């Protein structure tokens, strides 16, 4: 149930699984190769996500009928690269002028 710790919306779950399995080039010989094992594994091994032609995948989703997903898939890649990465700016000490 691991994507619950990520921005990948439930909509997008199924595409993410596919990204993880394909990024590892994981075992496809039986249904015993569950996608959750690929998630955990790729989550530990993020460099494997980074080399995929996601642009073609978006074309495929366009082809299945989902319209443009180019930016959506670049977001699932960023989620798996670091889940729920907090985007707040780095905490930094108040500036001298702020202090004053």
């Amino acid at each position: 149930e691991v994507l619950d710790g990520s921005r990948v919306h439930p909509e997008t779950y199924e595409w993410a699984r596919k990204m993880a399995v394909d990024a590892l080039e994981y075992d496809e010989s039986a249904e015993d190769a569950n996608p959750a094992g690929a998630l955990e594994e790729i989550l530990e091994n993020p460099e494997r996500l980074k080399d995929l032609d996601l642009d073609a995948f978006a074309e495929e989703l366009e082809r299945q009928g989902y319209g443009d997903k180019h930016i959506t898939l670049y977001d699932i890649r960023a989620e798996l690269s670091c889940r729920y990465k907090d985007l707040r700016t780095a905490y930094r000490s108040p500036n001298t002028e702020e202090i004053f």
Partner: protein
């Protein structure tokens, strides 16, 4: 002995009846080198009517095993038609559910090559093999063809 163990699988007539028999055949095929051992396995698999057993042969590198047995024969010999006959009868009999299994195992390019490379007709058999793989289940692979360099 590979031959003795293989004939022990033939002994039930119904081909490979169970998972241990298929695993044993897989391990036999990993050790098989002679023409009659290959012909016998092929006939045994053709005689194997159990769908799960055939699928498990494929799971157990079955297409890659057939591809190796085909490669040793070379790209054009007539005596090899005796073996190619059993190989294609077996490949035809095997229930491959996805097209990328064939890309991984590399059996398809040899069947194309043999169909062109002019007693059951191996070109007819090779032609009978090509069509059944078009109907294979929905798969796409995000191509790893990317020129973006792994985001540093």
């Amino acid at each position: 002995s590979v031959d003795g163990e293989l004939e022990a699988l033939m002994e039930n007539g119904e081909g490979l009846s169970d998972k241990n028999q298929v695993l044993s055949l897989s391990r036999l095929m990993v050790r098989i080198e002679t023409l009659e051992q290959k012909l016998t396995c092929l006939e045994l698999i053709q005689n194997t009517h159990s769908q799960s057993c055939l699928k498990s042969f494929l799971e157990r590198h079955g297409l890659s095993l057939l591809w190796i047995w085909m490669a040793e024969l070379g790209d054009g010999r007539e005596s090899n038609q005796k073996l190619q006959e059993e190989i294609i009868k077996t490949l035809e009999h095997l229930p491959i559910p996805t097209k990328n299994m064939l890309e991984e195992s590399k059996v398809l390019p040899i069947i194309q090559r043999w169909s062109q490379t002019k007693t059951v007709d191996i070109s007819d058999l090779a032609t009978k093999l090509l069509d059944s793989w078009k109907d294979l289940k929905e798969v796409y692979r995000i191509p790893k063809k990317s020129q973006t360099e792994k985001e540093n």
